[PDB]
Amino acid sequence: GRSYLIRTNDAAKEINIDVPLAVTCMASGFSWPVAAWQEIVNGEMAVPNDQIHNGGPWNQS
Amino acid sequence: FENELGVQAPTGFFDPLGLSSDGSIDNFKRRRASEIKHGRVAMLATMGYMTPEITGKFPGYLSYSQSIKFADVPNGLAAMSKVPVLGWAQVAAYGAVCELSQDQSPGTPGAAGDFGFKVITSEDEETLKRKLNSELANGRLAMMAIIGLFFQDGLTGGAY
Amino acid sequence: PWVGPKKGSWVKILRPESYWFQQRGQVVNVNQKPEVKYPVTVKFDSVNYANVNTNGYALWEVIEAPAPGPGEV
Amino acid sequence: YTETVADERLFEQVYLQYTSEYLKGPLYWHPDKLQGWLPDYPGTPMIKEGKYTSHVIGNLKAFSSNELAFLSMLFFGVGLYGNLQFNFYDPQWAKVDAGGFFNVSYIVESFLLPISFFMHIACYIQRQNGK
Amino acid sequence: XXXXXXXXXXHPKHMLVAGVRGYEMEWQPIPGDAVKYPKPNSEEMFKTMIGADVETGGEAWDPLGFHKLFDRNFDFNMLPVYPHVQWLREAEIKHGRVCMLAFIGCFAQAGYHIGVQPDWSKALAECYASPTGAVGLFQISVLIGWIEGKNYNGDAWVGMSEKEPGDLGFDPAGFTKNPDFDLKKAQLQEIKNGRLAMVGCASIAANHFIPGSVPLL
Numbered sequence: 076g077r078s079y080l081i082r083t084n085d086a087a088k089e090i091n092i093d094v095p096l097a098v099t100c101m102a103s104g105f106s107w108p109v110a111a112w113q114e115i116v117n118g119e120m121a122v123p124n125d126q127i128h129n130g131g132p133w134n135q136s
Numbered sequence: 137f138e139n140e141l142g143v144q145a146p147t148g149f150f151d152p153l154g155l156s157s158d159g160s161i162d163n164f165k166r167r168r169a170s171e172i173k174h175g176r177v178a179m180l181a182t183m184g185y186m187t188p189e190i191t192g193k194f195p196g197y198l199s200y201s202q203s204i205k206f207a208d209v210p211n212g213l214a215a216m217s218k219v220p221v222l223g224w225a226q227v228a229a230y231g232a233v234c235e236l237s238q239d240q241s242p243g244t245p246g247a248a249g250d251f252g253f254k255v256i257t258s259e260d261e262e263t264l265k266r267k268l269n270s271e272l273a274n275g276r277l278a279m280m281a282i283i284g285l286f287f288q289d290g291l292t293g294g295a296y
Numbered sequence: 297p298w299v300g301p302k303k304g305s306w307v308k309i310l311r312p313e314s315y316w317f318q319q320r321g322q323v324v325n326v327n328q329k330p331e332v333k334y335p336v337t338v339k340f341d342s343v344n345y346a347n348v349n350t351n352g353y354a355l356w357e358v359i360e361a362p363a364p365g366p367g368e369v
Numbered sequence: 370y371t372e373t374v375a376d377e378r379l380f381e382q383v384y385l386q387y388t389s390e391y392l393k394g395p396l397y398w399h400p401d402k403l404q405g406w407l408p409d410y411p412g413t414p415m416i417k418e419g420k421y422t423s424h425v426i427g428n429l430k431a432f433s434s435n436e437l438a439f440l441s442m443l444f445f446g447v448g449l450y451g452n453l454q455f456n457f458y459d460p461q462w463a464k465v466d467a468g469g470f471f472n473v474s475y476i477v478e479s480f481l482l483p484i485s486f487f488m489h490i491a492c493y494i495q496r497q498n499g500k
Numbered sequence: 501x502x503x504x505x506x507x508x509x510x511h512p513k514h515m516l517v518a519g520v521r522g523y524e525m526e527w528q529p530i531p532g533d534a535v536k537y538p539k540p541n542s543e544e545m546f547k548t549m550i551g552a553d554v555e556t557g558g559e560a561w562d563p564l565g566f567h568k569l570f571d572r573n574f575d576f577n578m579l580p581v582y583p584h585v586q587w588l589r590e591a592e593i594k595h596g597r598v599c600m601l602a603f604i605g606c607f608a609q610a611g612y613h614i615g616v617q618p619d620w621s622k623a624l625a626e627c628y629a630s631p632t633g634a635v636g637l638f639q640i641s642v643l644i645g646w647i648e649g650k651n652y653n654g655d656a657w658v659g660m661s662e663k664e665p666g667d668l669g670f671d672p673a674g675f676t677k678n679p680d681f682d683l684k685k686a687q688l689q690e691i692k693n694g695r696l697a698m699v700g701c702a703s704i705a706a707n708h709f710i711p712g713s714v715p716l717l
C-alpha cells in the first residue's frame with residue numbers, strides 16, 4: 076500500500092486504481108522486511124517533523 | 137636528569153637500564169613521586185614488621201564481632217588472610233582520605249613539612265637538600281628491606 | 297524589483313494556525329503593492345476543511361522550500 | 370510617507386526586542402518575577418552558563434571536589450556493605466524473628482548508598498565548576 | 501532582480517529544533533550523558549574509521565546500517581536515541597578487550613585454580629554467594645568502577661568525544677609508541693582479534709546453554 080501511494084502521488088489514482096501498478100506493488104511487497112529496513116537506515120522512510128503538519132497551535136500571543 | 141635529588145655518595149646518576157635517558161620531564165616527576173611514595177610507605181611498613189613482632193600487640197580486639205584480638209593476628213604475611221577483610225578496605229579508605237588531604241603544591245611531593253602531618257620548610261637549602269636526600273636514601277633502603285622481610289617471612293615460616 | 301518568492305516556486309508555510317502549516321505549495325502570485333499585508337498567494341494540492349486549496353499569506357510566512365518529491369507533503 | 374505593513378511589523382519587532390529586555394530588569398515587578406516563581410533566588414543562582422552552579426548542592430557548595438569524591442566512594446562502600454550484609458550475607462531476619470534485635474550498624478550503613486549516589490553527583494557538579 | 505527581504509519581514513524557518521536552544525535560552529545542564537548540540541556525521545566519520553578489511557569486502561562493512569541510525573535520529577524524533585559511530589567503536593573495542601581476556605579466562609579456569617572451584621558458567625554466581633577470602637570480587641569491581649569512571653567516554657554518544665575511541669592512554673611498555681608503526685595496522689589487528697574473541701565467547705555462551713549447538717564444547 077505504501078509503495079502504491081508513493082508511486083501514485085495523486086487523488087485520481089486512489090479512486091481509479093492503476094491495476095497494473097497496483098498488482099506490481101502487491102507482488103513487489105514480498106521483500107518488505109529488507110527493503111523497509113534499508114529505507115529506515117538510509118533516511119527514506121521517516122520524514123523530519125518540520126516537513127509535516129505538527130498539529131494545532133498551542134501558543135502565540 | 138642528574139643534579140636532581142637522589143644522587144649522593146655511592147653512585148651518581150645510577151641508571152644502568154636508562155629509563156630516564158629520554159629526558160621526559162613529566163615522566164621523571166611521576167617516577168619521582170612514585171619513588172618517594174613507595175619509600176614513605178615502605179618505611180612505615182618496615183616499622184610495621186619490627187614493632188608487632190617484639191612488643192606492642194595492641195590490647196583489645198580489632199574485631200569484636202569475630203572475637204579476634206590483636207595478639208591473635210599473626211605478624212607479617214599471614215595477617216592479610218587473618219586480618220578481617222573489613223579492616224583492609226578501611227585501611228584503603230584512610231589512605232585515600234590522605235591521598236586527597238596531602239595535596240601537591242608544585243611538581244614533586246610536598247606540602248607537609250619535615251614529616252609534620254601547618255609546619256614550614258627547612259629554609260636553609262643545605263639542610264633542605266640534605267634532608268631530602270636522606271628521605272630518598274632511607275626510603276629506597278626500606279623498599280629493599282620490606283621485600284626482604286617479605287621473602288624472609290616466606291622462607292622461614294613466621295616473620296623471623 | 298520583484299519582492300517575495302518567484303511565481304511557481306515552492307514555499308513552506310510558516311503560519312501556525314494554517315491548515316498547511318509546515319506544508320508546501322506553489323506560489324500563484326505575489327502582490328507588489330507595499331500596502332498589502334498578505335500579498336503572497338499560494339495554492340496547495342491538499343484542500344482544507346472548507347474545500348479551499350489556495351490562500352494568501354504574509355511575506356514572513358513563506359520560506360521558499362524545494363519541491364515536495366515522492367510521497368511527501 | 371505612509372505606514373506600510375512592513376513598517377508596522379518593524380515597529381512590532383523593535384517594541385518586542387526592547388520590551389523583552391526591559392522586563393527582565395529591576396523595573397517591571399510582575400508576580401511571575403517573585404521568589405519561588407521563575408527567577409532564581411537572590412543569592413543562590415542554580416543554573417548559569419548551562420551548568421549547575423555550586424549553589425545547587427546547598428550546604429555542600431564549600432566542599433572540594435576531592436572531598437566529595439572521597440565521601441562518595443566511602444559512603445558507597447559502607448552502604449553497599451550494609452545492604453549486602455543485611456540481605457544476603459549475615460541475614461538479620463532469623464535473628465530478629467526469635468526475639469532478637471537488628472544489627473543497628475547495618476541499618477545505619479545501608480542508608481548511605483543513595484547518599485553516596487547523590488554525593489558523587491555533587492562531586493561531579495563541583496568538579497565542573499572548578500571548585 | 502529579486503529584492504532582499506528586510507530583517508523586519510524575514511522568516512524564522514525551522515532551523516530551531518527540539519535538540520537545541522530556542523529563540524534565546526540555554527539547555528538543561530545534564531551531567532555525564534548526551535551533552536552539547538548534536539550534528540549529523542555518523543556515516544561520514546564511519547567511512548573514515550578503520551576496521552574494514554578484506555574478509556568482508558574491504559570497505560566499511562555495515563549491513564543493517566547500524567552506523568547510520570545516529571544520522572537518522574534527526575529525521576526520526578530529532579533526538580540522538582541511537583549512538584554515534586564513536587560510541588559504537590568504544591563499545592567495539594571494550595567488548596573486544598573484555599572478550600580477549602574472558603576467552604583465555606574460560607580456558608584457564610578449566611585447567612587452573614587458586615586457593616573457589618565451580619565450573620566457568622557458574623564461577624561468578626558462586627563467588628558472589630560464598631565470600632570467605634573472596635575480597636577479590638570487591639577489588640575487581642572497584643578496579644572496573646575506577647577505570648570506567650575515569651575513562652568514561654566523554655560525549656561519545658553524539659560524536660563529540662575528544663579522546664580517540666578506545667584510547668585509554670594505556671601503553672605501558674611502549675609497544676607502539678612509534679610515530680606511526682602503521683598504528684592503523686596495530687589497531688586493525690586489535691579489532692580483528694577482539695571480534696574473533698567476541699565470536700568465541702558468544703559461541704561458548706550459546707553452546708553451554710544450547711547443547712550440541714556449536715561443534716565441541
Ligand SMILES: CC(=O)O[C@H]1CC(C)(C)C(=C=C/C(C)=C/C=C/C=C/C=C(C)/C=C2C=C(/C=C/[C@@]34O[C@]3(C)C[C@@H](O)CC4(C)C)C(=O)O/2)[C@](C)(O)C1
Binds near residue numbers: 286287289291673674
Ligand atoms: C618501558 C618500561 O620499562 O616500562 C615500564 C617502566 C615502569 C614505569 C618502571 C613500570 C613498572 C613497574 C613494575 C614492572 C612493577 C613490578 C612489580 C613487581 C612485584 C613484585 C612482587 C609481586 C614481589 C613478590 C614477592 C614474592 C615472594 C614469594 C615467596 O613468599 C612466597 C610466596 C612463598 C615463599 O616460600 C617463597 C617466596 C619466594 C619468599 C612473590 O611471589 O612476589 C611499567 C609500568 O611496567 C612500565
